[PDB]
Design an enzyme around this catalytic site. Sequence first.
Site, PDB file in Angstrom:
ATOM      1  N   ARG A  79      29.691  39.975  38.949  1.00 20.18           N
ATOM      2  CA  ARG A  79      29.780  40.433  37.558  1.00 20.18           C
ATOM      3  C   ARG A  79      28.911  39.576  36.651  1.00 20.18           C
ATOM      4  NH1 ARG A  79      33.494  38.917  34.861  1.00 20.18           N
ATOM      5  NH2 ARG A  79      34.956  37.967  36.341  1.00 20.18           N
ATOM      6  N   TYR A 218      26.509  45.762  42.318  1.00 17.59           N
ATOM      7  CA  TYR A 218      27.501  44.840  42.856  1.00 17.59           C
ATOM      8  C   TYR A 218      28.858  44.974  42.169  1.00 17.59           C
ATOM      9  CZ  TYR A 218      29.344  40.707  45.134  1.00 17.59           C
ATOM     10  OH  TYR A 218      30.074  39.834  45.902  1.00 17.59           O
ATOM     11  N   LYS A 227      37.262  47.134  36.939  1.00 16.91           N
ATOM     12  CA  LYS A 227      37.329  46.352  35.707  1.00 16.91           C
ATOM     13  C   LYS A 227      36.991  47.187  34.483  1.00 16.91           C
ATOM     14  CE  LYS A 227      38.313  42.584  37.947  1.00 16.91           C
ATOM     15  NZ  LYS A 227      39.662  41.954  37.825  1.00 16.91           N
ATOM     16  N   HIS A 247      45.504  42.083  33.888  1.00 11.41           N
ATOM     17  CA  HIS A 247      44.897  41.450  35.053  1.00 11.41           C
ATOM     18  C   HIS A 247      45.981  40.705  35.834  1.00 11.41           C
ATOM     19  CE1 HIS A 247      41.440  38.645  36.628  1.00 11.41           C
ATOM     20  NE2 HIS A 247      41.696  39.622  37.487  1.00 11.41           N
ATOM     21  N   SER A 269      42.198  32.235  38.678  1.00 17.01           N
ATOM     22  CA  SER A 269      41.596  31.867  39.956  1.00 17.01           C
ATOM     23  C   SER A 269      42.584  30.916  40.599  1.00 17.01           C
ATOM     24  CB  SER A 269      40.226  31.194  39.823  1.00 17.01           C
ATOM     25  OG  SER A 269      39.715  30.869  41.110  1.00 17.01           O
ATOM     26  N   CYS A 271      45.842  29.682  42.252  1.00 13.02           N
ATOM     27  CA  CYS A 271      46.460  30.345  43.391  1.00 13.02           C
ATOM     28  C   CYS A 271      45.515  31.321  44.069  1.00 13.02           C
ATOM     29  CB  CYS A 271      47.705  31.130  42.979  1.00 13.02           C
ATOM     30  SG  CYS A 271      48.800  31.463  44.370  1.00 13.02           S
ATOM     31  N   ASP A 296      45.667  42.765  41.709  1.00 10.31           N
ATOM     32  CA  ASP A 296      44.615  42.534  40.713  1.00 10.31           C
ATOM     33  C   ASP A 296      44.899  43.178  39.357  1.00 10.31           C
ATOM     34  OD1 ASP A 296      42.054  41.310  40.056  1.00 10.31           O
ATOM     35  OD2 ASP A 296      41.229  43.313  40.030  1.00 10.31           O
ATOM     36  N   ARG A 397      32.847  39.147  49.459  1.00 11.56           N
ATOM     37  CA  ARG A 397      33.979  40.050  49.295  1.00 11.56           C
ATOM     38  C   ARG A 397      34.352  40.767  50.588  1.00 11.56           C
ATOM     39  NH1 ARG A 397      36.239  40.239  43.837  1.00 11.56           N
ATOM     40  NH2 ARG A 397      34.847  38.648  42.954  1.00 11.56           N
TER      41      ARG A 397
HETATM   42 MN   LIG Z   1      40.384  40.254  39.155  1.00  9.15          MN
END
Ligand SMILES: [Mn+2]
Length: 607
Positions: A79, A218, A227, A247, A269, A271, A296, A397
Amino acid sequence: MQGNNLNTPAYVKNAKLIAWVADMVALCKPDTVYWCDGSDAEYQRLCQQLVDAGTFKKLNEAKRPNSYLACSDPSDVARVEDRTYICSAKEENAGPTNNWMEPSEMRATLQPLFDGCMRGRTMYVVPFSMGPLGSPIAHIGIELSDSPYVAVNMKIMTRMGKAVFEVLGTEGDFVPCVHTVGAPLAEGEQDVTWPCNKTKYIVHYPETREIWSYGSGYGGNALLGKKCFALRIASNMGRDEGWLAEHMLILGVTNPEGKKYHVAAAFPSACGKTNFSMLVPPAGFDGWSVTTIGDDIAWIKPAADGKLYAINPEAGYFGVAPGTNMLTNPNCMLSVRGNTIFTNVALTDDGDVWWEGMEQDAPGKALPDHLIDWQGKDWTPQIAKETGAKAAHPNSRFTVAATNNPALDSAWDDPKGVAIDAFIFGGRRSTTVPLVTEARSWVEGVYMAATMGSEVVRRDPFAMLPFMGYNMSDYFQHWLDLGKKLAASGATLPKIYTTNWFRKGTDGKFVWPGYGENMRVLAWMIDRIEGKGQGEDHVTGISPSYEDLNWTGLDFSADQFNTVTSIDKAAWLKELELHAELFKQLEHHLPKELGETKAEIERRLAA
Ligand SMILES: [Mn+2]
């Protein structure tokens, strides 16, 4: 003739949709238009097209069945927040956490870029539902894209294809999304394996729900359901209609008596939502189970019964691979045993994939002797020492269907959603923030979420800093008003917790073991929800004492616990100075309740 030139299928009965596709085909000028039906054969054919182009390598069928590896251009690996815009009519409704441009100016900027952008390419029409199909709470999107990589990943990540048009009918509305890699092809021109453009725009027009993406192939730039739709556009719809697009992971936790609770948790980010949403109960927790609704995105709506009901609008996981192993996340490792698309990880000598962290499962924790890294280069532990090269890109990913998860919750696709008993807001902090704190009130929990930070400490309110569809301060107000309106209906509001797995001890190491041991903190939250858990009231909320947690199966001492859980007044005075700086950056359009909470913390610090 129009419909015939669009190759419109007979099941598409929606005239507004067809007219919009026709306008975008007129603009983008693809060589051909292909409507994705979402079939498995179509998926296999598109995967084969990607193999034939060199974008995909099929992985060894004995190691990693029906799985593929894609490697991207090094300019197109994540991103791009600086190229992402909220083009509301007024700049104030984008706010200080968003990039803004007058919509008419942005439209004039994007028109010449999208004019002819798909020359030499196929336009894939990707219909998808965010949320269970036909459901009253799902929203339909249509993404036009010139990337078959986007089409196959959208098949996994959303409910994609022909079934959407039965739900749309003749007049149903949809979120309009256009995507191009920005790499039109001339006659006889050889394409590259990962087409993209150095020039990138990811643009949202909230008043019309339009999403336009140019130049990246991407992830969050190009898979527009994840998103762009399910957070940025959906947060705007939620503000107007009385619901939340967050989120957050969603998990179910069942205790040995069979009582089932659901929790929604936002981590920057910290955990890893993915780790916590698939948590495996450790020793001492026989008879407990944790199940995954989502990892997510959460869409959350109050119901007439006074409860907040959450659904996961996605259908798969688009997860960060590095760090994943059987110790940090066995349910994720099992999920990616097959039927997975991997992006920018490494290739082993036997045709499997590898990423940093997988050596934790190897005998002696030994690194592999040789790999091909995500740039196609030879990689060895020696080479890594000499060049610093990671074998897998840090943002690499996996894409895999939710049904591959052995811990998938039975209600993961229930259109009624699940009632949320608690919210959790994480953050990575070496100092200051306790392992876990319960907010004394809804407003104080909103304050915790608004001020959450992650390590220098970067503030990421609600973990939404890159994803807010409108002014961040108005979003804080939406949270406060939702809680007020619910409490006014008599409802019992979910508890709000802040967690911190990352307090450091006097040796600079993390004290808390984390991963499965986070179950012990989750179980205290459950005790509190039931009214049976005890705790110590302090400056910012209520925290457990050592004796309030279950230590069966874990050697963890009272001093270790107090090292990660005790609060210090000096540290919180410094922390409140950092909150003041954040509030200045949010230009002091903040809800008065956040100022009152800060003042009350200050009073407790000085008492
Ligand atoms: Mn996310």
